[PDB]
């Protein structure tokens, strides 16, 4: 189940200055970058155009190109419409896309965050405020819902254009998505917290456990999944032990890249 994300982030410092940058993810892999400086959207994968024709992508890029400008003036006008109830600096994020499921099944989303808090979502045919959101947002919402063009466009994009495009992406990016990368493991200790460093594995699912021969340790504490530059994963596991207990122990790593060939690393 791959989740497709178009991540927009807009900074409004004062009444005049502002910028908007976008990044696009299919799963844990980046497909597009759209910097504020770049008038056009940039592909970050050879397969980022999915199964779309050149005309189709162009009609779709031009649509977004207009949106970015439209969005910039619109916020500034909504700030004026609200003032003094809202004030600069203003920080707005958008998480929009569609998650894919077996068959031709998918669910689309458009989530808007105001000042680091999730406040607004597009649902069905209209914009609405989420629970917890302030009541003054009802007016901007009403105004956006007045615009029937945007509503029709967003419905098409969320209902049709998102899942159609991602179904095309999965075919074009199979080799990169279904790619397998072997993890590399090394050990260290710190004043002793025994660490099992694991790096360079793809996909993201992994199994790293400390074992005293067969004894799966109850004190194994897995850390956070941290990224690498070459689009692979890094993770570490810290064990809580006393001095002298260094020998006799090992770190075992299970991954799809090895296929039964479990890495076992003795200290």
């Amino acid at each position: 189940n791959y989740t497709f994300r178009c991540l927009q982030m807009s900074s409004f410092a004062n009444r005049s200055w502002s910028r908007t940058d976008s990044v696009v993810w299919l799963g844990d892999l980046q497909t597009h970058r759209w910097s504020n400086d770049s008038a056009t959207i940039s592909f970050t994968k050879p397969w980022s155009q999915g199964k779309l024709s050149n005309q189709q992508w162009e009609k779709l890029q031009h649509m977004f190109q207009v949106y970015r400008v439209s969005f910039t003036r619109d916020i500034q006008e909504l700030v004026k419409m609200m003032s003094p109830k809202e004030d600069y600096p203003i920080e707005i994020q958008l998480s929009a896309g569609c998650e894919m499921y077996p068959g031709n099944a998918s669910e689309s989303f458009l989530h808007v965050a105001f000042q680091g808090k999730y406040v607004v979502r597009f649902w069905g045919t209209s914009w609405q405020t989420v629970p917890g959101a302030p009541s003054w947002l009802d007016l901007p919402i009403k105004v956006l819902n007045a615009d029937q063009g945007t509503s029709a466009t967003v419905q098409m994009l969320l209902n049709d254009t998102c899942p159609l495009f991602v179904r095309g992406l999965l075919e074009a990016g199979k080799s990169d998505l279904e790619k397998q990368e072997k993890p590399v493991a090394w050990l260290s200790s710190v004043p002793r917290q025994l660490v099992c460093h694991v790096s360079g594995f793809y996909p993201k699912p992994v199994w790293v456990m400390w074992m005293r021969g067969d004894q799966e340790q109850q004190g194994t504490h897995r850390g956070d999944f941290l990224p690498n530059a070459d689009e692979t994963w890094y993770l570490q596991a810290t064990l809580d032990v006393e001095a002298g207990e260094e020998a006799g122990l090992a770190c075992r790593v299970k991954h799809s890249s090895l296929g039964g060939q479990d890495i076992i690393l003795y200290w």
Partner: T-cell receptor
Amino acid sequence: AAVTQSPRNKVAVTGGKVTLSCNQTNNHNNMYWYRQDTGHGLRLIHYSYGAGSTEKGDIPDGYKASRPSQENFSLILELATPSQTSVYFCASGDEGYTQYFGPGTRLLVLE
Amino acid sequence: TQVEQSPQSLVVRQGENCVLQCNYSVTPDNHLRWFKQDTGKGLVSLTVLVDQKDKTSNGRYSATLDKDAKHSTLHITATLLDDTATYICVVGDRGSALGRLHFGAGTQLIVIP
């Protein structure tokens, strides 16, 4: 929807204070001040998103705007000039795109 | 000036048809509206076009919108003496109150009785 303007027609002197009024009982949040000049289309001067609000338009110089209430939106010319001789149009509207225009105000500033 | 009207002025005889042009570069083009302004009077709306390819008709008035060409025409069928007025093209950049309207200078029409 109805929008009224007062006065309908006005003659003023350079340096004098002139207040053009606009009344709307449509309960519209938004109200707009334009001027019409031969050779140009209507150009925006000032606009308000509700009581208290006022925002500069495309050509705001020489004009001050006041929105005392939902009902009324005034254009104030502090020190009148012959360059401000024009037909001034007022418009109002809700959250939709439709702007409902008043009858229009002819202003003539003489020396 | 993102809105341009043609002709600047024209003179027709009672009964004949006349077509009025409007070309614009306004981005985006949500809707286009036609106004009739009798000399000294205010702005009477004639019609409003909204679709990518659009056609409307209000009595003897009929207008067409082609957004791809960013171009619009207003045909007046069987002109009457009453039609002597300036006809104004107006493009709005949003489908809500966030929009700003962009006004053409107007095509002048004089109908000979």
